[model samples]
Target: PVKPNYALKFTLAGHTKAVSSVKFSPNGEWLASSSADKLIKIWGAYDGKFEKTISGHKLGISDVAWSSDSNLLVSASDDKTLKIWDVSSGKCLKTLKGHSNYVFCCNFNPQSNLIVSGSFDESVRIWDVKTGKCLKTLPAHSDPVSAVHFNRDGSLIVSSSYDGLCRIWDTASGQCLKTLIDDDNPPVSFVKFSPNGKYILAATLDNTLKLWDYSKGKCLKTYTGHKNEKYCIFANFSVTGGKWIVSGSEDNLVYIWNLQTKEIVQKLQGHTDVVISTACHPTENIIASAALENDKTIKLWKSDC
Candidate 1:
């Protein structure tokens, strides 16, 4: 029952191609964006000022994640590699190469000691941050693994695939602990752990967002009212006690839904093209979104809180 009273804060423009991903640093001081233009850009999160651009990827960049300390960033690319960069120096620290196909998503564990990456090669790989060596590779899914994430304590990993499944694995043993599947069997684009690690939120190709009770492998709720026909869209829970779910849509808008009511609370419209990704600030009443194609700018939204 939270009311929508947010306004467009500002727009960040620089990427020459479609922006694929946008993420805020753990400390909330920096924002990182990756694009199909083969570059990654950093911005002042609070001020919206362009800071630096890290250019090394030869193909479109697929995803970006910030280290827990906010000192480093890791990027996945269509070039089939993951590159770790120093945030301050804007230098490429190490390039990890193992995936046979495009790397679709990557994330640094809470401790920033390890990285988990998902790829179109149908595998998930774990790498040592200090040595830049892959520690383990799990043959994860039947189709392309589109997204991967580590739980809050880093004891578990979750991966979503186009094969219509989201599997949870034990980090230590790399054993598949559970496989989450929907009866309708729609392709899953992204999956995320709830703030408290009690639930899983998944964005599927069927234009619906699903909430699941991970331990029981049961679907608790399914949220509709958004279009995701052509691209991989991402969704996230609000950090304000997980009261709302936010996501971008192929309908050229960002939708915010009340977690308890399962109703659209806000529909933000401004982008001329389909919004491909949306991210909520870790500790603020703010959200950021990136659109596809000619709409390469990143838009920021802020609530009156």
Candidate 2:
């Protein structure tokens, strides 16, 4: 069972505009957040002070990812551009432009100097971090791609699209490995590879979460409990040595699911509005979620046992 009583230690608020994404740095020393204000801000994770603001995007930024070493940060914007920034100097090192529409999600390849971006233009592109060149564009999704992520080994790239499908591609050959379909649902809002890389988790507009077997391209299980559509889902191995998954729903609740037995462990109720995003701590079992409440704050939660 998932334990509770973890109080909210603090609140970090700096974005004057709608915050789209927030991610903690590798060492958990800095927190990066993107907003509709067309700016990216990094905060001191410990002190909750605004450390730096990096600006260049003409429109809102949708996502941000820090490099594995935490020296560089990349952001995607509705301006259809990707900007890579130096974390230490707060300087834009490279600006990559190729997407014909809004760049919704961008993630760095954990094992290499590569980054993958998914765009509303119905394509996913792989980029070389150093040269800022578009290495390959996988244009197979029928509609706007909402999310993109690399497998644990960086051997595969998975993308979710508004076309109600999730496609996995071979990172090296750019070959389409699998196209997963959710027949009973609308478009999938999010898709992520499990921490162990053996399972794929997807959240759909049908208010259901599905787990898929990556190798066989088959749905392993369907988890249903939320009352409304799920906006995002994240799966990670908790510090307490169990597989846990958390999802934010339009139902205004963050549901924590236990992966081993495929059950809803706890329904974390607090957000008064629809949850926009949810992320698990890289090194701990903590979770952070953001919503569209009037306060517009990001709240942190710890999973204790």
Candidate 3:
């Protein structure tokens, strides 16, 4: 058994409303949090010190992403727009407007030149970071598209929806390459590509996390033991060779599971409310989590030994 000793290092308390997403910058220098208060806060990743807040979205912020260069940040919001911001200046550079409904998730491509977003409109749209033009639109799902992500090579885009389906698409042709469906057809809340791009991880409302081999269209593993009753919780892989999976639970705990064994290795408890999101540092033994409703703080945890 791989035992990890981790403890809460710091609690970031600022947002007056519930936080939705937290992400570490690609360079490992900064962290960003999106909240229901309609603001995005930036902080020093290493010190946990508050930096600046970007406020322009009229509605709650749903998700945020950092560019590979760490120079830009992209955000999705309930205001029906995706806004790109300059990290250094904290200025809104351009707003990409096309989605007719609330934008739920946004991510930058590997080259940081393009952005892919999912929306409640049941569509996935790709946009150019430079010109703010809509590159392509795929009527991706029968229900609200909850999450969208790009593979390591940016050749394929994966999206999950409330319709209980996950679809893989060819970026160039905007074609649906494959559709991943569970036997129960439970609503999928989130989907992410592994570090090496060989696998995909999905979190479902049915209270399970599934691992899939996209190339062969097979479900390799299903990880349970976490409460995912209502929230759109997220899951991530450890940066240390992707040996484990980390995610938050509606039961108010952060869970770490061994990828190979499918065992719950660790369950971290601190928050008083539903743990909505969890993010692992790109190159460190650190993890951050955000809580919903009554608990508005972001807690950072690090491996002590």
Candidate 4:
């Protein structure tokens, strides 16, 4: 605690394959992890204790996103299905289907009324949470869709593509508001919205993550110096430190940067394989990062020394 850094608190293990995603339940009580091993697990956020397991997806689970209220969990699967779970009881509540190819990513808005998802079928679909019905099927990209997310207020949805494009959509009209791309035009692996809803974070496979202005559609910050070319790796804005950019890298490291200066504040180590996904605690100094098949473990880092 003397110098201020993200130190490893402990590591959690159980997945048999690459750990695709991890999320902190918005209530800040529990943490969740999913994998291509076809399983989702919940654990005590601070204690690292296992509580429950989810097993409904027929194939590998690609990613999991927790609802804003923290009671519901949405999982996208490689089987072309997305299942909403009641984390309260650890049971499946809704199973959504539409795409013919692998579903890659999904997210719930602040109100949890809508869930926007992207798939390998080159589509982005919005599912109504209450009825589990597909509301809007937007043929989003020419190549496989990698990531889709809702802005803070839930008025806009952003989708990233393997063909090197990032499109912003208006939630009410289902119309693309803007198309964003980098000059180099590298394949995008992941995307997300800044907490304030003023900017977009787009991760490209050319080994950099750029933060863009949502309105102007121009890059504002370029975070580089890590290997991000292989897997659909993850990065995000942490609630702690006023804000720090946390990213998982193929170089087997986690990079945390000061939000304003764009300089690497700290780098976390210890994984033996590509670090694929990272989760920042909603209201604490905790961060959870998981790796690929070789590691198969979740490392929790906190500055609570």
Candidate 5:
């Protein structure tokens, strides 16, 4: 019965095409968006003021993440490259190249200067952000690594693959800790660490979201409602001391779930097409999602106010 109280509409009329990704900074001050027009735009978080536009990728950008310091932004693209940029100057700081195929996702460590990336080349690589050096290569996934996330404490790295498995690794030793498989499904889109760090949540093309207790290594509950082909799921602890999970689905709705009750608490609606990504404010209950369709749109929603 909860409804979104706030809406942010931005006219990114420059792309001449579809916008694939949108992300807010860790501080929630700026929003960055990228598109098939091969450009990235930065906008004011509150007023939607057009601040700057960044361009470098020859092909469309696939994913983007802001650094913990909020000073740098990293983007992965179908151009088979990853880039690190300085936000203030809108300058490309470094271009990471090694993968023979497209780079789908890249993110920085929570407290270190390391960068990790997953690619369609069926490998996940760890890089030194300062020198652009490849530190380690994890080749356990037979299919492309669809998603990757480091734990809150950075002790472990979790990655999901089209191989239908979630692999947990020790960040320090580059050793595989565990291989998690869903025998009932083909593959999963993403695996995420719960805000409290006790559980991991994963979404699959199987049209269900599953929760796993990290300490127990067993699947706990299955959330059904999303359509098949749902590609992204995210979990974060809210300021209200409640754990929330939000997922973007091909069904065109962003479903918000209460982790403790394992129930659908609310559904956010606005996008008319495939909802590809959702991000909850790191410090607030606000949520942002982007869609891919004939008319691409980005919708912003806030918790009951």
Candidate 6:
């Protein structure tokens, strides 16, 4: 990975509706994206060229999470299910069912056979990738669960909800270990684990990204300068040049912040509509971003950082 400036490299389009999420395969070969058009599109991670379009869902897709090996991917959809797909064959491998409402987000644990998901049903569920069995269900929140992510080791999970809370869970015991919340009680729209697993970063509807020490239920730092009030925008830790935080904005731009200094360092521009999601390449100095219905485009950026 390089260290420096980020520039718009390409604007790829094919989705007929809003693009919901864009996540890079852990190795950075392909970027997997999902849309409300009930389709999943794959693109070259470096060149930003269209690769494939997968179809099967009866309703819109909200998010897609790539398995660590890049062989499979799981998608959350309005159809109330998460479907695992064989990326190369474009085949639906297994359909994990249980959520009674729209499935909002899903993530494959980086080091295990387990998968975690969040839903409008306000629950967090763990599934076995091979068996397609729901291992455990935690009555996670009072409001819709916006996001759920396993810590780096997969022993813990952090769930964020619209009810203004972010709760940590014991992966094996289905026990709520801790609750992270802001004093003002702003609804959290997204949450992610820090690269080291020692902290958490929560995206709030109050237009700020919060860095928290979840074990102690503390807010260590607050990052602002991004508009994120109405939609389920996503953000995460980026290691382009050094450690940084990148987030999608309702103002149609992607904001990047220096991790240690907690300062806005860059703003990625191109989308003409709300930037619904932003994802940094897992192993490269590249980032992928997608917008809503009006834009319906994915833009790739490269950095010398």
Worst 10 residues of 1 by lDDT: 1-10
Q: Highest lDDT, which number?
A: 3
Tell me each candidate's RMSD, in Å, in order.
Answer: 1.1, 2.2, 1.2, 1.5, 2.4, 1.5
Give the clashing pairs for model 3.
none
lDDT of 1 by residue, 210-296 (tens): 899999888888889999765788899986544788999998999998887899888998998999999988888888999998799
In model 2, where do residues sit more than 4 Å from their true spots? 1-6, 227-241
lDDT of all predictions: 0.91, 0.78, 0.91, 0.89, 0.76, 0.90
lDDT of 2: 0.78
Model 5, range 1-305, lDDT digits (tens) per residue? 33334354443344556667778888888888777777888876655577899988889887888889889988889998889989899899889888879898777888758888899998888888898788898885888888888888888888988889888888888899998877775787888787667788887787878889866788887777777564544433343324666777777777777665668777767777777777776665567777775657666666553
Tell me which of candidates 1 and 6 scores higher on lDDT.
Answer: 1
Residue pairs whose backbone atoms clash in candidate 6:
2-305, 3-304, 3-305, 4-304, 4-305, 241-305
State the local distance difference test value for candidate 1: 0.91
Clashes of each: 0, 0, 0, 0, 0, 6
Q: In candidate 2, what are the lDDT values of residues 1-305, reduced to their tens digit?
A: 54433345556676777677778888777778887789888876655577888988899988999899989999999999999999898888999889999999999988649999999899999999999999999985988887899988899999998788888999999999888876764888788887778888887777777888978878887777875454444333344435666666677677767666778777777777666767666665566766654545666776555
Error of 2 at 254 (Å): 2.1
Return the TM-score for each candidate structure: 0.98, 0.91, 0.98, 0.97, 0.91, 0.97
* Model 6 accuracy (lDDT, Cα): 0.90
Residue 56 shift from truth in candidate 4, angstroms: 1.1
Write the number of the candidate with greater lDDT, choosing between 2 and 4: 4
Better of 2 and 6 by TM-score: 6
